[PDB]
Design a protein around this ligand. Structure first.
Ligand SMILES: N#Cc1c(Oc2ccc(F)c(NC(=O)Cc3cccc(C(F)(F)F)c3)c2)ccc2nc(NC(=O)C3CC3)sc12
Ligand SMILES: N#Cc1c(Oc2ccc(F)c(NC(=O)Cc3cccc(C(F)(F)F)c3)c2)ccc2nc(NC(=O)C3CC3)sc12
Lengths: 257, 256
């Protein structure tokens, strides 16, 4: 197999987001696509490597809850093509336009996000940057995990503390997931009463700060609230893995009207 | 670079349908999945080849309007795993529960079907059995093209019916089938409903004596679309347009 797209097939439309790791456009290639591009003439050795690394990961994935990789181009410039999601990121819903979902729906969104992560961890893919802004709510129904991009609020202590050359683990992604659950159940970002990034870093690293779980919706089930607490445990080893998380959600999910 | 699924991760659930080209079960592998598996002790060389061809083809696809292939196992038995689709086929909507879609959507369904078919043909895949029961309307708003078995004469081009050649299939026979599907969308009906004899339909379509009655299209089906249908249904292969042209024609009247 080979997913190279011949040149002059992709038409590039309106810009969507810009930053030196690439530029994202809405484009046309057998319908609507998203197109990530490097905006330079001659790319560096570090950018070329990371492109092959991104594509190497994406082509290993085929699942409804993961943004569908469609192809790449290098011919005119470096480019990665994916499906074009209609809708909004979770972040956009929760913190910009402030959509208020029914509890039944919030739990579904959670289940799907968990479903997708289960798949990645089964493939030995660690996401490293899961957060509400990299979860799209496709056609207002299906979750698509992607990477639309540091992001401190979703970072586990052992990552914040660094120290270790590789603090990332399935359990770090679980912690990130735990902060997403917090966003879903409270409709808010954590540590909203603190306006200083350095302190948040220092305090989370040291264990003096945790998300305030009393801010959860009144109709958020106890079972869910306990799942949060376990995902957000300050110690890696106590955090559950996605198979158990998934099972957990599905038990309290069916236990509802 | 490989898609094999280790033994015993798939839970085969309820049986959906079963012909001698495999059996389709609803299953569980990282969520709801469809599982088409051969139900035999020991596969024969040409069964083993059909499997490899089907897997070979599915793994060439990554497009929103094509059924998402997820993996295969040969471990306990030969099997192919795809996404599970929610809802029902276009055939079922049009001819069974007789769903009344607005024209806005019928055209949208036409567009998506064309979108996926252009993808296939760009990848050099000829479908060979395009028809409304092979078009799933997923969550009631996305077209998923595939094979949803459990032959089919109403979608066959004249050159296919005649069967003069070892291989009469082309990009243009897929276009004709698409053309018949446009007829279903735009009329709610199967073609040739006034004729109760299968061999006669076979004969006359083959000969050019019979073709779909375009006057049965709904009154608000725009003239561009009737005209488009007519070109897809032409009896000479070479006079039928290819898919980029179809996609372009539909995208034109869509926006207006
Ligand atoms: N921005 C944006 C954007 C978008 O971004 C792209 C585009 C191309 C890409 F290659 C990527 N890269 C990845 O995600 C790859 C990746 C990296 C790390 C881990 C993983 C994994 F999860 F798979 F492990 C995957 C992201 C995609 C669709 C899309 N649709 C939009 N629609 C709207 O805004 C309008 C409707 C309102 S915006 C938009
Ligand atoms: N039957 C079924 C079925 C299903 O079938 C599978 C399963 C595995 C496979 F390998 C295939 N193989 C192909 O499609 C092969 C192919 C041939 C020609 C061209 C092309 C291509 F277009 F891809 F090129 C591909 C088909 C998939 C989902 C699904 N969901 C359902 N839901 C319900 O029953 C309703 C109650 C809710 S039934 C169902």
């Amino acid at each position: 197999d080979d997913w190279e797209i011949p040149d002059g097939q992709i038409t590039v439309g309106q810009r969507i987001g810009s930053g030196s790791f690439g530029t994202v456009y809405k484009g046309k290639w057998h319908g609507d696509v998203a197109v990530k591009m490097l905006n330079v003439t001659a790319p560096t050795p570090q950018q070329l490597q990371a492109f092959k690394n991104e594509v190497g990961v994406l082509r290993k994935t085929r699942h409804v809850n993961i943004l569908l990789f469609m192809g790449y181009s290098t011919k005119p410039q470096l480019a990665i093509v994916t499906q074009w999601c209609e809708g909004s990121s979770l972040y956009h819903h929760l913190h910009i336009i402030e959509t208020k979902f029914e509890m039944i729906k919030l739990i579904d969104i959670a289940r799907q996000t968990a479903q997708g992560m289960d798949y990645l961890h089964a493939k030995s893919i660690i996401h490293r940057d899961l957060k509400s802004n990299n979860i799209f709510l496709h056609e207002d129904l299906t979750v698509k995990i992607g990477d639309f991009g540091g992001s401190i609020l979703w970072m586990a202590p052992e990552v914040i503390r660094m120290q270790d050359k590789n603090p990332y683990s399935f359990q770090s992604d679980v912690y990130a997931f735990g902060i997403v659950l917090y966003e879903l159940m409270t409709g808010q970002l954590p540590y909203s009463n603190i306006n200083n990034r350095d302190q948040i870093i220092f305090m989370v690293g040291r264990g003096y700060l945790s998300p305030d779980l009393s801010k959860v919706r009144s109709n958020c089930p106890k079972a869910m609230k306990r799942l949060m607490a376990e995902c957000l445990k300050k110690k890696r080893d106590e955090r559950p893995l996605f198979p158990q998380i998934l099972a957990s959600i599905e038990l309290l999910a069916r236990s509802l009207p």
